[PDB]
Amino acid sequence: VLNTSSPAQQAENEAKASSSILINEAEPTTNIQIRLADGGRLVQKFNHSHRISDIRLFIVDARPAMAATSFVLMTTFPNKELADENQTLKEANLLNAVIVQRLT
Amino acid sequence: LPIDDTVEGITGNLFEVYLKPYFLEAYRPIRKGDIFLVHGGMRAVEFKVVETDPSPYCIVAPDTVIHCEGEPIKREDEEESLNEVGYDDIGGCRKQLAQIKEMVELPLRHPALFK
């Protein structure tokens, strides 16, 4: 789908998504860019250590239409699926990687 | 653009299995002026982009609606004219070409070199 959120509400949604994710200063910080399904839009806001479910909650707080529609994330050409949302970033190869989102 | 040197041998619809499982829900960068040979349906298929409107540094996704074009036409004359000239295609007159570059240095990438 397209950007169902209002452009005036986009800044508030991104501020709420940034405030929902805690920021750490004593850890080696990574940054994860997710290729969104609304046209390939990109956002750059992530902390050092989190989970895939934290990425899902960041997407939910970023756009209100993603809460009502389920999605399965993917990455660029391993031909695999990003399941197991409680897994960390160490074993999921999500270290400054590319996450592609498809609505179910 | 499909090309009959590669895609000919498999038929069907023009967004069929021959490009599905690598550009499934893609949003991968295609570019006008780029031709890439991807194997699909047990056959290599080339893909030349020839027309794109919305900001030609563009994105297509074959899980969305595709304006698929299905004319296999050779462009071997265009393939030989894809490069068709270059600085590597000019030899022996490096000082003259350097002088020409010094003369035409102003219309490209430095128009404000008038002060």
- What element of type H or E holds A75? strand A71-75
Nearest CA in chain B to A34: B27
Task: Give burial (CB, 10 Å; 0-12/13-18/19+) of B39.
Answer: exposed
Contact (CB<8Å) A40/B59: yes
Instruction: Could you list the beta-strand ranges (E) of A11-58.
Output: 33-35
CB-closest option in B21, B22, B27 to A100: B27
φ/ψ of residue A10, rounded to 5: -65, -40
- Solving technique: cryo-EM
Cross-chain Cβ contact A35/B27 below 8 Å: yes
Residue A74 contacts B where some CB pair is shorter than 8 Å: yes
Work out the minimum CA distance from A2 to partner chain B, whole angstroms.
Answer: 12
What sections of chain B are H helices per DSSP? 76-80, 94-103
Using CA coordinates, name the residue in chain A closest to B20.
A79
Nearest-Cα residue of chain B relative to residue A104: B25
Resolution in A: 4.2
**Which positions in chain A touch B21 (Cβ < 8 Å)?**
79
Q: At what angle do helices A52-62 and A7-20 cross, to 10 degrees?
A: 150
Half-sphere exposure of A87 (CA within 13 A, CB side): 10
Question: If you search the block for the tokens 């046209």, which residue do you land on?
Answer: A39
What's the CA gap between B29 and B33, in Å, rounded?
Answer: 12
Q: What stretch of H or E contains A30?
A: none
CA distance A4 to A63: 8
The region, left, alpha or beta by phi > 0 then psi within -120 to 50, assigned to residue B45 is beta
